[PDB]
Design a protein around this ligand. Structure first.
Ligand SMILES: Cc1cc2nc3c(=O)[nH]c(=O)nc-3n(C[C@H](O)[C@H](O)[C@H](O)COP(=O)(O)OP(=O)(O)OC[C@H]3O[C@@H](n4cnc5c(N)ncnc54)[C@H](O)[C@@H]3O)c2cc1C
Ligand SMILES: NC(=O)c1ccc[n+]([C@@H]2O[C@H](COP(=O)([O-])OP(=O)(O)OC[C@H]3O[C@@H](n4cnc5c(N)ncnc54)[C@H](OP(=O)(O)O)[C@@H]3O)[C@@H](O)[C@H]2O)c1
Length: 600
């Protein structure tokens, strides 16, 4: 009997399964029965990340109305549109449309979408689930696929295999290996990069000095598990929030190179579907860059693309500030940085000190010197109160927060520019990977306003201290010493060091047995751009055929999602409804390429 496999049953593998079911009526000759083998060690639909068993203190950073696993009439794909409830719609009042659902609520949704997909499967499709890890993929002698499972079963005679493996484990770095040995030598707790939901924090005693290294979204997970996750609660009084300790909290210290928590997402004022539509980095501009890349002279991010992005962000900021319909047409007609930008801003009455400054935005303390921890704390509380305030204004009327949400709304235009060798190698390395991606994340992939407010209250209550910029950490006899060179008197010896970040996809250092087998036998390879290696797994153009060390696109092997980071930009994001989501059209294209290779 005809047979294919999907490796991974998270949102992406679940979506491949739903799109297979959708197009199998059209693409399988009548009377043909296809078995789809779905393989995941975690219960299928949510997979590992979204599993319903995890702690309820952990949130999504997407509002509930903007999360789906269903196609809609806006999705440009060849498969049939099969409409279904968004997270919000399904949750039946459990969560508001502009509120952040718990990860377990998204799990309960994903669980239901898996079960529904099975119930609605056409007669031509039989689904077989496997509570196992796939560990080897090989060509059989005839060119069909053998997939070996860790439970001793082997799947043979496979027409196609889809790898939707998502957030894979990575070998500990050199730094993380030293810091873990140090914990072993002096009985300390080292927690290496991980989903915060996957870590055991119960070994951290009340009052323990802990360093959270990292101030992004992993940091806010840990912040919550070590406070509200231990009996802590908040109380709102005359608008302002207050933390009510349980007495079980550690003494939490945090820091990073930048020294700042990620910016609050402006409160959504764009409803479920609305966004800033591109007016500088436009489809027309993106076609011009694709053409230059295909004819072998790819653009430079910093010289060619950044100026278009900065112009959009600055334009939306000043449009929200001036609120005059004549303004934006005149500001858009000017090249980025032209002397007339200033003259026009002056004409519409914008003081030289409300002007935009990428230096203030990324390094808002940089004018300022800190005599001790207390000056740093007073400045930081000022900063976080101003961030919360700005986010309350929302992503339409709030000048700053609408401007920064542009960075979110340009993701698809930027994907189309940089993806599949769209940049010179040296630019991808020095401009995108090592500057823009992290800045972007700081500015536009931060937490809900609520979490900034909470952190503000936790600083006031003394439960959490943020150390300061350029976090230094040293192994010392019996502890780690953490300080900020920019904040005298911030030295503190901790006995728990938590790396508050996810492992970044790295094929080179993968801990997944299956990808390691494929790498070592030359059946996949790191995606390389002009001599820069990304450790994404290399794939072809949609529908993303796996590429081997010889440069051959495998007709029977597809890869889709986080492991392809480098080929694709910001793969760690879900599907949005009503905005021609590329996750859903990618899934449709993969499903039809699989059905086609099976029905010859
Ligand atoms: C902590 C965290 C929070 C996030 N929050 C958000 C958010 O709020 N909003 C958002 O849009 N995105 C969020 N994301 C991004 C996330 O990448 C996507 O939402 C989505 O989970 C990606 O789907 P996926 O199937 O590609 O990957 P995953 O969700 O990682 O699924 C991969 C699945 O494949 C399985 N698998 C891997 N290797 C094998 C193997 N060899 N054999 C069998 N099974 C295997 C795993 O067990 C897992 O179930 C978050 C990610 C993380 C880690
Ligand atoms: N709330 C949620 O839904 C949630 C939770 C977790 C993760 N996620 C998803 O996963 C992605 C990654 O999250 P993340 O927290 O790992 O990344 P992140 O949000 O970018 O936070 C990473 C932090 O680590 C710091 N950092 C990293 N390596 C460091 C080092 N060696 N030394 C010092 N500081 C270091 C970075 O700051 P500096 O660069 O300034 O040092 C930054 O402050 C998100 O973008 C999102 O898609 C979502």
């Amino acid at each position: 009997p005809l047979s294919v496999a999907v490796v991974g049953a998270g949102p992406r593998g679940t979506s491949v399964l739903e799109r297979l079911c959708a197009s199998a009526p059209e693409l399988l000759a009548p009377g043909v029965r296809l078995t789809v083998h779905v393989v995941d060690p975690a219960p299928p639909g949510p997979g590992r990340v979204w599993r319903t068993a995890q702690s309820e203190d952990l949130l999504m950073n997407t509002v509930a109305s903007q999360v789906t696993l269903f196609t809609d009439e806006s999705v440009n794909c060849s498969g049939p549109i099969l409409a279904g409830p968004s997270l919000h719609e399904w949750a039946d009042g459990a969560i508001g449309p502009d509120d952040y659902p718990t990860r377990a609520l998204y799990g309960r949704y994903l669980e239901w979408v898996f079960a529904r997909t099975l119930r609605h499967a056409p007669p031509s499709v039989r689904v077989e689930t496997h509570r196992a890890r796939a560990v080897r993929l090989d060509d059989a002698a005839d060119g069909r696929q053998h997939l070996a499972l860790d439970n001793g079963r082997t799947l043979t005679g496979l027409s196609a295999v889809v790898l939707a493996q998502g957030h894979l484990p990575v070998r500990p770095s050199a730094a993380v290996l030293r810091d873990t040995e140090h914990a072993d030598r002096h009985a300390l707790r080292h927690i290496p990069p991980a989903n915060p939901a996957d870590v055991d924090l119960t070994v951290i005693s009340p009052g323990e000095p802990v360093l959270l290294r990292g101030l992004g979204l992993n940091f806010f997970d840990h912040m919550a598990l070590l406070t509200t996750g231990r009996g802590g609660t908040y109380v709102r009084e005359d608008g302002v929030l207050r933390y009510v300790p349980s007495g079980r909290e550690p003494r939490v210290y945090a820091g990073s190179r930048r020294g700042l928590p990620y910016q609050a997402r402006g409160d959504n004022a764009k409803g479920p579907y609305g966004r800033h539509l591109p007016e500088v980095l436009t489809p027309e501009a993106v076609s011009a860059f694709r053409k230059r890349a295909d004819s072998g002279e790819a653009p430079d991010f910093l010289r060619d693309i950044w100026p278009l992005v900065a112009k959009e962000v600055e334009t939306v900021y000043y449009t929200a500030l001036v609120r005059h319909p004549d303004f934006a047409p005149r500001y858009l007609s000017l090249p980025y940085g032209d002397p007339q930008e200033a003259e026009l801003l002056a004409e519409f009455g914008v003081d030289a000190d409300a002007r935009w400054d990428w230096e203030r935005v990324s390094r808002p303390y940089a004018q300022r010197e800190f005599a001790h921890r207390g000056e740093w704390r007073q400045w930081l509380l000022g900063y976080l109160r101003a961030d919360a305030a700005e986010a309350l204004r929302g992503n339409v009327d709030g000048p700053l927060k609408a401007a920064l949400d542009v960075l979110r709304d340009l993701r698809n235009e930027l994907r189309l520019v940089v993806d599949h060798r769209g940049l010179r190698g040296d630019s991808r390395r020095d401009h995108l990977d090592r500057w823009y991606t992290p800045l972007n994340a700081f500015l536009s992939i931060g937490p809900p306003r609520r979490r900034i407010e909470e952190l503000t209250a936790l600083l006031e209550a003394g439960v959490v201290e943020v150390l300061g910029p350029r976090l230094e950490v040293t192994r010392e006899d019996g502890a780690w010493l953490a300080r900020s060179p920019d904040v005298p008197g911030s030295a503190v010896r901790v006995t728990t060091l938590i790396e508050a970040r996810l492992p970044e996809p790295d094929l080179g250092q993968t801990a997944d047995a299956l990808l390691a087998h494929l790498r070592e036998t030359g059946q996949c390879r790191a995606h390389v751009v002009d001599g820069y290696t990304t450790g994404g797994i290399d794939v072809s153009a949609r529908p993303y055929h796996l590429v081997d060390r010889e440069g051959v696109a495998h007709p029977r092997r597809f890869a889709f999602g986080v492991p392809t980071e480098g080929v694709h930009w910001v793969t760690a994001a879900g599907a949005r409804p009503g905005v021609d989501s590329v996750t859903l059209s990618d899934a449709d294209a993969v499903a039809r390429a699989v059905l086609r290779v099976a029905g010859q």
